Every structure is written in structure tokens, then in C-alpha cells.
Structure 1
Amino acid sequence: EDAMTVLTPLTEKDYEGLKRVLRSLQAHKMAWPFLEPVDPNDAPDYYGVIKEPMDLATMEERVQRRYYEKLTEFVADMTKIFDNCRYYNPSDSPFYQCAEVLESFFVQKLKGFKASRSH
């Protein structure tokens, strides 16, 4: 990551862009596994093997409360969603596939956001 991403505080204008990025991911057809926390009734061992769970509803709460101070912190929570999924599930599962697709989409949107901060 470049210096602006790591070190520039998130302004109010930056926060309007983060809200838009988040809503775009929540509207994607392959985001269904990630919208809410993993349900322990459907995966009884999940919370014993994933030490730092993350999901898009937790990220929305954090955006609304202005939790993030730097773009790097927002990117780290999003990346945790996809990394947790690829560690828990096998490479041939539909869950793993959805992580591949949605991370590519996130990177496209993140590049757009970064371009809009500066010019």
C-alpha cells in the first residue's frame, strides 16, 4: 500500500466513499455468505478454529460509528472476511469460490475509491 492509504486520516468525504463501497459489496450476487456473522448452528466448530471472525454487517456498524481512522484499517477488516473463508473451507467449495469473486470486485471498487480521494 502507498503512503496515502496507510497514513492519511479518513475525512468525512472519505467516509461517504467508504459507505458506497460497502453498499456495492452488500448488493453483489455472490455476497450472500458474508452479509451476517457465521451461524454457529450451521458450523458448530467454526468459532473454535477462526480466531478473528468478520462479516459485512459488523463492518457497516463500524463505518456508521466512525471506527476506522485510516484506509488500511478498513482494507484489513475486509481482507479478513476473505482470508477466514479460504482458510475454513476447501478450495472446491462454493463458499471459497464466492470469496475469490467478491475479493476481485472489492479490489476494483477500492482502486476507484483511491483515485477519487486525490483528484
Structure 2
Amino acid sequence: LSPNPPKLTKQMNAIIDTVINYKDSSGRQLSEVFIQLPSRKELPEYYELIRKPVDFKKIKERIRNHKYRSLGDLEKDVMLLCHNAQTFNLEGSQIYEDSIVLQSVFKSARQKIAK
């Protein structure tokens, strides 16, 4: 487990920062609830359903520790976060709608920072 080049870690961090810092037109940070999973004691129901839990804390850690070897590997963990939130909280929940917007903000940020 050897280090990614500096320019790739600079790319990854700037994409995730955009997603995390994104505010909507009302002025609300959509990432807020996605920073940190609830614990298995708080909400066992989440862990009976979701096989591969992940939050933005873990995604920032996986950047620091060079576990993502491509912008592609990063996207997969973010899409997974957003799909887990969609699977658990179903269509019709604010948190499902928030996760959809964040998928879009991610792809939009990676399109700008891969230029």
C-alpha cells in the first residue's frame, strides 16, 4: 500500500470538498447527515439491510491512506454511499433526494477538476 502521486490526492480532496461543502438554493449543506453513519446500536435496522456501509469520514480516510488508486475508485465509494442511503430511506424521503443531488455534484466536480 504505497502512496498515490500528489496531483491525484489533490484531485480527490478537491472533488470531495465540493460535494461536502455544496449548499442548495435554500442554503442547506446536503452532506450534513452523510458525514458519519449512525452506530449499529443507534440504528441496527441500517446494518441488517446495508452490506457495505460507508460515510464521507471513511471516504476522506481512504483518500489519506491511498486506498483509492484512481478517481474511478473514489466515485464507486461515493455512488455506494448514495445508493445505501437510497436503499435504506426509500423514494419520497428528503435524504433520498439529497443523495441524488450529491451524485450529480460529484460527477460535475470530477468533470471540472479533470480539466
Give the whole-Å Cα distance in 2 for the aligned partners of 1:48 and 1:95. Answer: 19
How many pairs are equivalent? 106
Q: Offset at 1:107?
A: 1.3
Question: Corresponding residue for 2:71?
Answer: 71
- The corresponding residue for 2:80 is 80
Aligned counterpart in structure 2 of residue 17 of structure 1, from 6, 11, 15: 11
Equivalent in the alignment of 1:27: 21
Question: Partners in 2 of 1:11 and 1:38 — Cα distance?
Answer: 33
Distance in 2 between the 1:69 and 1:61 partners? 13
1:70-116 residue CA offsets vs partner (Å, 9 max, x unmatched): 2221111111011111111121111101111111111110111222x
Query: When the two structures are superposed, what TM-score results if normalisation uses the length of structure 1?
Result: 0.80
Please report the RMSD computed on the Cα atoms of aligned residues, expressed in angstroms.
Answer: 1.5
1:1-119 equivalence runs, <5 A:
11-28=5-22, 29-115=29-115
Deviation at 1:42, TM superposition (A): 4.4
Gaps in structure 2 of 5+ consecutive residues: 23-28
**Residue deviations 1:8-48 (CA, integer Å, cap 9, x gap):** xx531121111111122222211112111233354331101
> Taking structure 2 as the reference length, what is the TM-score of the superposition?
0.83
Bigger shift: residues 77-86 or 21-30: 21-30
Unaligned residue ranges in structure 1 (runs of 5+): 1-9
Runs of 4+ in 1 over 2 A off after TM superposition: 38-44
What is the CA distance between 1:51 and its match in structure 2?
0.0
